[PDB]
Design a protein around this nucleic acid. Structure first.
Lengths: 66, 155, 94
RNA sequence: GACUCGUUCAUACUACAGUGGAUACACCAGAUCCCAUCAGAACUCUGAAGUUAAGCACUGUAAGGCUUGGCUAGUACUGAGGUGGGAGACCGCUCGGGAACACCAGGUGAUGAGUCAG
RNA sequence: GCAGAUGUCCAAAGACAAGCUCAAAGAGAACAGAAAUCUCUUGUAGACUAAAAGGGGAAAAGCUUGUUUGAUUUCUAUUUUCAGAACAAGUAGAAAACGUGAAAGCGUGGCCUAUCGAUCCUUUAUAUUUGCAAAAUGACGUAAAUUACUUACUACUGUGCAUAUAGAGGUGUCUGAAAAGUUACCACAGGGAUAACUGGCUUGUGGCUGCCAAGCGCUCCUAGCGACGUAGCUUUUUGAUCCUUCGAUGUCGGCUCUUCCUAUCAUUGGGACGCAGAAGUCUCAAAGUGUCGGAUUGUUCACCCGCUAAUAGGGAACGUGA
RNA sequence: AUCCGACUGUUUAAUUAAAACAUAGCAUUGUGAAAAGCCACAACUGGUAUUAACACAAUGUGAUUUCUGCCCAGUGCUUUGAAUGUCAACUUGAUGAAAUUCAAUCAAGCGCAGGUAAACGGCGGGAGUAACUAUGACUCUCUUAAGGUAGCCAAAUGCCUC
RNA sequence: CCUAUUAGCUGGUUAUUUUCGAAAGAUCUCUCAGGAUCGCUGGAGUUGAUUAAUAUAAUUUUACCAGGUAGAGAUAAUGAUUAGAGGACAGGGCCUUGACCUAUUCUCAAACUCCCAAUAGGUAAAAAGGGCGAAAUAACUCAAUUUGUAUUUCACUCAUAUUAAAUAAAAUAACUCCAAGUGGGCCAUUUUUGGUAAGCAGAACUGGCGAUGAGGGAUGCUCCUAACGCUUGGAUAAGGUGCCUAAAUAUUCGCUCAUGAGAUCCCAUAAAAGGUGUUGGUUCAUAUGAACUAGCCCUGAAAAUGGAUGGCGCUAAAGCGGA
RNA sequence: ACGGACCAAGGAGUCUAGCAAAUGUGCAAGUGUAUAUGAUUCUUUAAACAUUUUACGCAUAAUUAAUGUAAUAUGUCCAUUGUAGAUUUGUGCCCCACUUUGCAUACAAUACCGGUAAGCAA
RNA sequence: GGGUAAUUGGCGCAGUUGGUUAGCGCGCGGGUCUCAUAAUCCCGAGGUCGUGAGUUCGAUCCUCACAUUACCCA
């Protein structure tokens, strides 16, 4: 029995019935494997700034908590 | 029956007339930053680091930079939805865009105008004009320049 | 396809210096009679029933992948794979 | 006037004539050493006896080409509408957008950074 | 559908650097010619680049030379087919040690687009990684101690076997069953998704009617014709399709019987003719009347004998099996 | 009168009575007996057989007449094998601490060398040539195993074919 | 008896109403009548809106992009492809044959392009953001522990009262989970492949049919108007106004004699060629001759049950084309 | 195109095991009381009731073939860090802008455990 | 895959450490009349490469080149 080998009819209407879906567009994009030896430095940067901020936080907390 | 890499680029990837030869020796010197908007143009003089069939002419943004590679994020349609796609291309093919120079110029004009506008405390319709209905005015024309028109005969 | 017999390359283990390597052509080697597959198949084949497994009896393509065994002169071995070809020889005339 | 490094990558090109030589580039003298060949022709090295003849710079050609503008022409063409016309092929109308080739006119560059010379 | 091609080939046809610039045409020079070597002039590819084709390529991606093996180990982000699975093929990187040039850089095969393959099983390599279910196999090795069931410290621990990682052995029906025919003795479930018969829509072929007029017709284009070309009707052949029925529409032909159509064979009345008359040819109005007996053959179709006035062409589910 | 079948006979109960079968004749093969043939049987055992080559079993063709041409390359079937290629178990021997791994051969069969076509089957293609013409008695040629012999015919076997 | 064997296949599969409501693609399949898969749908539940915003939009605009289809060409390349004008290697008797060269000429290309549309395509149009300086951090980079890069915290503040263009019954959103059906399609305007053509075979953007009736086309699965809770009035769409058949023998302006007139797209055929029929024009010649030109009409015009603009019939139309 | 001359009765998504999801309920780092045990229960009672100070399943911790190994790390009963984000306390008993807390979650970043790489390695 | 012979003159042939040899194919001479034929000589990677040994085609060894066998968890 001969069978229709292809069609693309009604496909666009089916697509637009639910509306063309958009990606969620989140804010941050992961750095799992992007250009290392730069984020390698950046992680140490973040660790250092966090360490300074948190040690100052603990110093203030102690000098206010006696 | 055949859907290879460069399929159907007999003219698209072909370099335009009298534009053969290697890429311009200044296109390497453009400056790129994360978050910039960029256009993707497939050149053919360079071979490796090549974009693909569909992506010629599209836009995107810069999120990945290597010694020579550039990764651009693009919205490519597939049936019922749009999904992000990251494409890695080379500096020869990539090209700085103009999709945001209009808005950048508008922002610069805003910064250099509304500053003094606020200094004077004036409100303006800083929204884009989109000129529609023209106003009504009076104009002059002497009777010596009114040239009539009439339909033409056949031949 | 002709390949020089001795090469200069990297050693993937026990060493980290670009040294000499002797190149030979890998051979399949006779299957062991005590191997698990053979003994299990023999156990299956005891008794009536005939063949109890398919036979790869199609014979479609006309060549085998070519593989080079590299001997690191210091010690130890390594494999390498070249694209399939019909003709292959060791260090033939230049 | 001159050069060096650039951009613009033919208005910057090409063919033919004329003009310009203090440093300028350049032709030019040579091959012991660095250096290369079949060949000091080229390349490399050392020089400045002679030099606008050539390159290079400028100008000229009812020069070709190139490049703008006009015209080709609202023509060819085409989106939407039509219980429009035509047996059909095709051709009107409303709301719309809009060519190219050939032809004519004008032009043959602009330019950054740095230096020498007076 | 169309024009083709692939299941290979290559230590260089791979990497890099440097130098040079190809075809062709003209001009010239012993043998020497259309072509043989050299040199000159012009020369944006008209050659060359493994293959088919399509792109790209000029101080090169081509030609010549030089040094070389990055055609290497391991791992990510991803693009193409897309389920946005994979493999595959790539693209960009990273951690290594290298080659190349002076460096900048470039190198993860072939300037780009095709050149290829799961599970399980087998085999070969790698491994300060393991077991072989109460135990051990260097080795009593080392320090002390005595005639013993002595004590501390050991990375190097029997054959064979299973694993872990990595390639390879092919599944071309190529996302992967190990596989010869026949039923005219047949059986079953189904199919008008699907043949053979009408019916249908189309008219290529078949038949029929035209248009134009070079020539034929003693001269004379249209009495009768009419090539070379061109426009239509037909469903009476064969075609093309498979829209209707495979829970059955009784599929050839002959016998018999009725009507209908006209593109008239004869008969009616005319017209024309290259018509003396006769005979005959073309043709307009015309379906009222008529279109036969036989031999051969299953025939339709066909060919003969004979009379005829003439022995015209067709349909009706190829008319007609209660 | 022709074709078929030699005749009498048998057969598709309920669509086919024949040209189908069988028969007499012709010819082949196996078989010397209980250690054989053909066959049945799970094993014991049995039929042929109360049998003995003028017999038993399996075959093809089908009175009589005259014939029954050629090929053992193909596939079958069969005959000889201590020279013999290949080939199992077992055994022997070697190494090994043992499993193990290795070599050797006087099994049959296949191969080697024969025979057999009333075993299955097969039986050519091109050119040139003779006082008219046409053909080809013959010559050359490619090739197979031989290349359709005696005979016969648009036969119930010839499409072209009416 | 195993056995109520198996069956990708046929037939059937029982009460209402309401709400929502499809597909006949695409990948793989010893797959082509099946299946798994996403895609389309329902149900459930959650986060965000309820503040004429922000996300958001089959939308347009402002700016900025990319293409090589029609079209246009042959002198712009390649391949064709027709004739001459002119001009200095070979053949024979200044002469001839050609080839060859310069500029012209006739016509082309789904697998030609110096050029290039409309359609369709893409991105940006400011607050989880940006602009403008300091202070820290780093093992990254740079000659630079101070060159920068990126980060954090502070400064300062960028229309926000219409809202960084317009307009938006834009939060009827976004997400997650469970699941059925589906996985043979077809018709229509336009584009287009094969074939002569087909109510054929095969695709393309969109709409329908299926899944759907209502009025009209006499009648019809797809045409036109228009999509449906149950009634009462008004006024319409398409379409009609001689009767059938509700409404104009309505008005007004011209054409038409048919001894087979004509009367709506799909839609149910008609041509090449003609006409001294008639109506109106244009070009020429001295109200006349010719040549053209387009409306209607006539010929061309032939098929079988008896036949159809739907019938009747229709001519100062109830035909044709208008107002 | 196929089944239906007619009537009345019968006539088809059920049951079990296992899992998942949705919902409701109890309990909650525990949960279920299994076989089975005791009782002046012993028509109905083949059901209800009850279960002396680790029985098991499922969960609390994962991972690798595997010998096995096993979640910050003792500065502190703070309980990792960001961007938003519900609430919250207040300034200008009902809006918006200003500081305060930052649920849940969403997108990330960090550490830490097993595994495999790489460097070292007694 | 195993196992074996084969491929060396132009035919075909077998040979093995102190070796390249012939019957035929070819050349001419000479010859016994015309044919045979003594003998010179054309003819040899001893299928290929490498290896072993005072001394090799030979001894060891792999590459493909030819054919019945046997297994086709390949």
């Amino acid at each position: 029995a001969k069978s229709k080998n292809h069609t693309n009819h009604n496909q666009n209407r089916k697509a637009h019935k639910n509306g063309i879906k958009k990606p969620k567009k989140h804010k941050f994009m992961s750095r799992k494997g992007l250009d290392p030896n730069f984020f390698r430095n950046q992680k140490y940067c973040l660790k250092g700034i966090q360490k300074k901020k948190k040690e100052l936080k603990l110093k203030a907390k102690q000098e206010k908590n006696n | 029956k055949s859907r290879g890499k460069r399929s159907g680029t007999r003219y698209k990837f072909s370099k335009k007339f009298r534009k053969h030869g290697e890429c311009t020796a200044n296109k390497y010197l453009e400056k790129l930053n994360y978050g910039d908007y960029v256009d993707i143009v497939c050149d053919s003089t360079q071979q490796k680091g090549m974009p693909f069939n569909y992506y010629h002419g599209k836009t995107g943004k810069i999120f990945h930079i290597t010694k020579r590679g550039v990764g651009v994020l693009v919205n490519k349609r597939v049936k019922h939805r749009i999904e992000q796609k990251k494409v890695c291309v080379r500096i020869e093919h990539v090209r700085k865009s103009r999709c945001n120079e209009d808005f950048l110029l508008r922002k610069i004009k805003n910064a250099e105008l509304i500053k003094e506008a606020k200094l004077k405390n004036e409100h303006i319709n800083i929204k884009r004009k989109t000129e529609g209905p023209k106003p009504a005015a009076m104009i002059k024309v002497p009777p010596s320049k009114i040239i009539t028109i009439e339909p033409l005969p056949f031949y | 396809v002709n390949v020089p017999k001795t090469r200069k390359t990297y050693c993937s283990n026990k060493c980290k210096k670009h040294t000499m390597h002797k190149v030979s052509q890998y051979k399949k080697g006779k299957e062991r009679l005590s191997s698990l597959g053979r003994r299990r198949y023999d156990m299956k084949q005891k008794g009536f029933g005939g063949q109890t497994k398919p036979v790869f009896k199609k014979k479609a393509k006309t060549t085998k992948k070519i593989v080079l065994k590299l001997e690191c002169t210091k010690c130890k071995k390594r494999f390498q794979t070249m694209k399939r070809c019909k003709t292959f020889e060791m260090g033939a005339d230049k």
